[PDB]
Amino acid sequence: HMASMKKEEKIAILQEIIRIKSVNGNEGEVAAYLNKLLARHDITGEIVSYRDGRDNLIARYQKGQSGKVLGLSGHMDVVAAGDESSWTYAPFAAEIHGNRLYGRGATDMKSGLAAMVIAMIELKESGKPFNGTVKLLATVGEEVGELGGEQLTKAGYVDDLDALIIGEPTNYSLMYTHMGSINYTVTSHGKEAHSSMPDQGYNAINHLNEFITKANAEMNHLAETIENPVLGKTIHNVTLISGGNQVNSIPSHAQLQGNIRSIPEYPNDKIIALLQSIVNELNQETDYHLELMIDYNKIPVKADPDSPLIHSIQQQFSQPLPLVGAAATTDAAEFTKANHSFDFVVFGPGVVTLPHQVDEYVEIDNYLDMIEKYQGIILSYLA
Amino acid sequence: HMASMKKEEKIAILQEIIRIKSVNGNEGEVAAYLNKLLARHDITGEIVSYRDGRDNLIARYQKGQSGKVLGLSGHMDVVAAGDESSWTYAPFAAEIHGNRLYGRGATDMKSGLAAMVIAMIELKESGKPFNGTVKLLATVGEEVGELGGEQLTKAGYVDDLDALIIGEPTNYSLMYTHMGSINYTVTSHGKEAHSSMPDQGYNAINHLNEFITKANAEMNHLAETIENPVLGKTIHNVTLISGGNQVNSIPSHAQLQGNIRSIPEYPNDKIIALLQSIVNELNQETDYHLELMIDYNKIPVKADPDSPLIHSIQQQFSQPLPLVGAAATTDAAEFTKANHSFDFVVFGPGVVTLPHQVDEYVEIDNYLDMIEKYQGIILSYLA
Ligand SMILES: [Zn+2]
Ligand SMILES: [Zn+2]
Ligand SMILES: [Zn+2]
Ligand SMILES: [Zn+2]
């Protein structure tokens, strides 16, 4: 006859992890808090350190006959709040106003992470039967690099999964596919000369311009001819540029960076080879070269929309939730590089328009309901 | 039986104006020095102030019957010396080593200016006959803006000239034509959006790229089809660029600057209209616009190579000097906007490769000879 966890504690746990400022760092403080919570309920977590102060957390709960393994994942970092004077309620204070809990990370994605941890605890304490294992994977650095997701995948922590739910904010929709993301840099080398007698120089800005023209034309042709039924066309933008040193000097250096959002129908390998090809055609017959560097490279993700995991989730509702795609990357871009196929979906509480925005909040009733819905999902999937 | 000016004084005058650091300013100190020198020899100059501390100097000497007016012009500013540790001899110390007098401005163009002033004084004191007037026009700010040249032309000080020599460093060649120079800026306005969902934005870098492609192609077509017999083809380079604020944001601002060197066969009016046309074609059907600003606009210069002034100069030599053109602008780009035609040439002492360079020097024998050659030129032209 063990006591239930009360509503006020479920809310306080979320507030206390929001108040841990974990902007591109400090995830070890969030992991320690959640590992201490799990220990209060006789679940022993495993800390997997990324770097000083930045720790991932893994935890398992098994019951019944050896069966499938269901992973529940979320990230512990958040994006910067920006100018805090612009917020109505302070971003790391986790204030409650009515049904809203305000704070950076309330929607993206400390509510989903807390809901997953509490769902595991309540699953255990409910004593309800199932046959398999549920595994938490709480990651470092999803927002800038998917650092923990890559670390855990390379280490082997995804190898036993039959299915994975990532608790990013989808509200009541199931995101089963999302785009990839590439950030790249092109650097252009030239030779200085005075603008009045330029023949001994080489204009680095001109050579960079020729890359922009050709890459834009090739990427637009790719958008016009190939598309994904859910995610749309490949996206490409040059987003930063610099070059030159004085108005009357031929520029000896220029550089740009750009962002691409990719789809399975024309994958990252092909995009990078295409960019490299363009650089190669433009470097013919000169010793003043463009050079391509890939700074970020996250693959598209596409799961089976009819998987047993998705069926187990839809079984929790009197009407099926919408299946959707999204543009932004998630830690699935790293976990899906594991050397086997697993069922996958993104499903988490939150307000879909508010990740990374001023005055971010989550709806308390949504958060509390997802604690219960995760338990139902686990019990169905692991039946 | 008045005393001659000795060689050592002619050299000391040049050293003392080189030691007045007049980098884009302080020309009033050079003007005051030269006006005091003229007064020691009973020539009264006229100070024409540009701004506090930046004064032009005009002086006249007449003899005989009213006749032609010959102008002698030079500028009193110099370009920056840069890192002085890179110089072998300190740039504002005017040290003499053998036949070389080292210093910023020694070649460009304090030697020509001092030689013109001394030539006027010696012309007067020689008592040699002529019929007309020789007029010094010593200007502020030739290197950045041709400020004094424009001021004096607008005021009316060029209106009486029949001929003009500018004493820039040509060594023993006669520069009778030079290119124009335009510096321009193009600013591109767009709209911010996240790189993952860019449809509500507008990429300012892309629109700027389209300007570079079209302006480069039109300017190259102009180079390939039109040329000047002495000055060559029109030159165009984009030399500075910037744009964007974050790699995952569609850029809302971008800008470039560029430099053009123009020829009489396709003059500045036409170049500016062509650039504007390109901006206009590219702004069709959008509210996110490119904008053109002209920052510098100096016209080409072309004199009569067979003028009486040139004949008077060639009469000083047993073999004619080469007639040449040059790429760089001079104050003639402002003086030739006077509302009448005058004979023109650039002829001055100096080492042609050294304007604006480290370890600039002038050859002392070249400087002293030009003091004498200017007097001969005046006496012939004003015979
Ligand atoms: Zn997230
Ligand atoms: Zn996020
Ligand atoms: Zn000069
Ligand atoms: Zn100069």
UniProtKB/TrEMBL annotation, chains A, B:
Keyword list, A-Z: Amino-acid biosynthesis, Cobalt, Diaminopimelate biosynthesis, Hydrolase, Lysine biosynthesis, Metal-binding, Zinc
Domain (Peptidase M20 dimerisation) ranges: 176-285
EC number: 3.5.1.18
Protein's pathway: Amino-acid biosynthesis; L-lysine biosynthesis via DAP pathway; LL-2,6-diaminopimelate from (S)-tetrahydrodipicolinate (succinylase route): step 3/3
Annotated residues for binding of Zn(2+) 2: 108, 143, 356
Gene Ontology biological-process entries: diaminopimelate biosynthetic process; lysine biosynthetic process via diaminopimelate
GO molecular function, one term: metal ion binding
UniProt binding sites for Zn(2+) 1: 75, 108, 142-143, 168
Catalytic activity line of the entry: N-succinyl-(2S,6S)-2,6-diaminopimelate + H2O = (2S,6S)-2,6-diaminopimelate + succinate
Class in the EC hierarchy, top level: hydrolase
Cofactor (UniProt): Co(2+); Zn(2+)
Source domain of life: Bacteria
InterPro entries for this protein: ArgE/DapE, ArgE/DapE_CS, Bact_exopeptidase_dim_dom, Peptidase_M20, Peptidase_M20_dimer, Peptidase_M20A
UniProt record similarity statement: Belongs to the peptidase M20A family.
Protein's name in the database: Probable succinyl-diaminopimelate desuccinylase
Source organism per UniProt: Enterococcus faecium (Streptococcus faecium)
